[PDB]
Amino acid sequence: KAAAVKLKIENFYQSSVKYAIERNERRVELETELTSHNWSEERKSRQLSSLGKKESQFLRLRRTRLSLEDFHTVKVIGKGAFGEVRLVQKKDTGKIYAMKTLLKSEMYKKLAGSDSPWVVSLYYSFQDAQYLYLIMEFLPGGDLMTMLIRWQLFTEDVTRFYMAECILAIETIHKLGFIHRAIKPDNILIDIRGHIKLSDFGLSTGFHKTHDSNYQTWRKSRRLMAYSTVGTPDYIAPEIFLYQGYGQECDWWSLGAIMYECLIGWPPFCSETPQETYRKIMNFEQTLQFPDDIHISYEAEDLIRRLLTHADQRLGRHGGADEIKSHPFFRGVDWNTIRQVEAPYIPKLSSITDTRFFPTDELENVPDSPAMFIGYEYSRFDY
Amino acid sequence: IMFLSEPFVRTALVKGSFKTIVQLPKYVDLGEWIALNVFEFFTNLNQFYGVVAEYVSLPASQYIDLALTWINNKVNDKNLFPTKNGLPFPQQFSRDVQRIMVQMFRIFAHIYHHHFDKIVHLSLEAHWNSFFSHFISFAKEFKIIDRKEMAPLLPLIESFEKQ
Ligand SMILES: Nc1ncnc2c1ncn2[C@@H]1O[C@H](COP(=O)(O)OP(=O)(O)NP(=O)(O)O)[C@@H](O)[C@H]1O
């Protein structure tokens, strides 16, 4: 009986068909998630147990609502090009919460979840207009370059502890089909128990290309303006610049750069400028020098020498993640028991707001600000 | 040259699947699952009148920002909304959404009356129906909406399968 057709002439809803193609998914999403309800009918008749009324209770959850200023900031912690990090608590409940401010647009490059023992576990995400905001588990023990400043470690069984435990830290990274490919003392955090959790590159950007063409208190000439631009080829296996390549061997190499700075106290290539690496770091071989402060074990030295060998394939293995554990440098440990052991240094903090292991100060630069509500929908549940 | 009129919503033929969604899941607190479905039905309806925005059996209307943002402000009033942990709800909310599920309708069938005319023309036509069917078959499930209230949209309600 009925008839006609086909108008679609108006500015009006230019895009408002967005309702149509969105809601379908929200309906698809609605459906499955309500058969996600049927994680019930799991049905144990198995036990002879209670009785004892109803052993089932579930809120269940909520998809809730959010904001900043629902967050009472405790203190500042760190910064970046994408954004700024912090230490905060939730104004409502109160809690130990790390806080990551970052840049959405404008930020470029416009997969995997989580977990592991060795990695800072990301809680969740939300964003306002310009900035991205995060929560991760707060790790009270600062970062590793921060520890290197206050005392440039004299190591041995201190560092024997800090590698190993870092080998395993990367172990789960590569095991999970990843290369962290950012090996930084400040990419590494120390937990309450004195052990290590590294967050991840995250993944926040930057690169060195192609090249540039121009034409004990005396050793405290470390801490040079921190960075506040960064990053240096502290590590930067020179398989990255130049071209594509690498895999794991970038990471192990990059840990040779941290072995050095732990023992004798500086990036081997310490450039005093940004671009004396690539340079030195590109080259090495000839440009890797071992000073006459002549104390080191053979085993500690030989290790940085198989670390700072190439990414080299061909005759050999590298081939790593093990053969690496095989090294005589490591007496033990059981490679498990390391998780619970006296950490040569466990942070002494009088309270839980203690920032004592982070350098407050100030800078105030995020070349962004002009200057002048979020959502939750997931599957699983924590903790 | 310069004359207008009113209504006429008819008829049917739309969208997909069936039912079973609006049913309270096993062993879930009702007060939650209410707030859930209504905190959906709002944004979706507003996303639909967000399509018909401006362009102006019904009031003189074109108020509806006055009517909807009453609810936009009232869904953002935290004290009716069990956000925190296990922190619970008044259950005097019965007066609240026996009012509030049905405020939504008064825009709903208002769109259906006069402005479901344009709805078709978009060729969104079939979404409005099952979404309304879902809003309804939620309300007809829980008696959340009173019966006498439903008069103007009753014809579309007569449909093949809704609830
Ligand atoms: N949960 C935490 N525990 C300890 N330190 C943290 C925590 N969250 C953030 N930080 C600090 O924030 C600093 C830097 O944050 P980060 O995400 O690394 O900035 P970035 O420029 O994005 N990444 P990177 O270049 O490796 O520093 C770290 O070095 C830590 O000092």
Numbering used by the authors:
A (entry chain A): 282 to 391, 404 to 508, 558 to 714, 739 to 749
B (entry chain B): 93 to 148, 175 to 281
Paper text:
In the RAM network, the hippo-like kinase Kic1 activates the NDR-related kinase Cbk1, which forms a complex with the coactivator protein Mob2. In each structure, Mob2 binds to the conserved N-terminal extension of the Cbk1 AGC kinase domain, a region previously identified as the site by which NDR kinases bind Mob proteins. In all three structures, the Cbk1 HM peptide is wedged into a binding slot in the deep cleft formed by the kinase’s αMob helix, N-linker region, and N-terminal catalytic domain lobe.
Another crystal form of the Cbk1(HM-E)–Mob2 complex diffracted to 4.5 Å, with one complex in the asymmetric unit. While replacement of the phosphorylated threonine with glutamic acid at this site increases Cbk1’s activity in vitro and in vivo, it is uncertain how closely this mutation mimics the biochemical effect of phosphorylation. In our crystal structures, unphosphorylated wild-type (WT) HM region (HM-T) and HM region with glutamic acid substitution (HM-E) associate with the Mob2-supported binding site in a similar manner. Similar MD analysis of the Cbk1(HM-E)–Mob2 structure indicates that HM-E also has more restrained movement of the HM region within the binding slot than HM-T, but slot compression was significantly less pronounced compared to HM-P. This suggests that HM-E is only a partial substitute for HM-P.
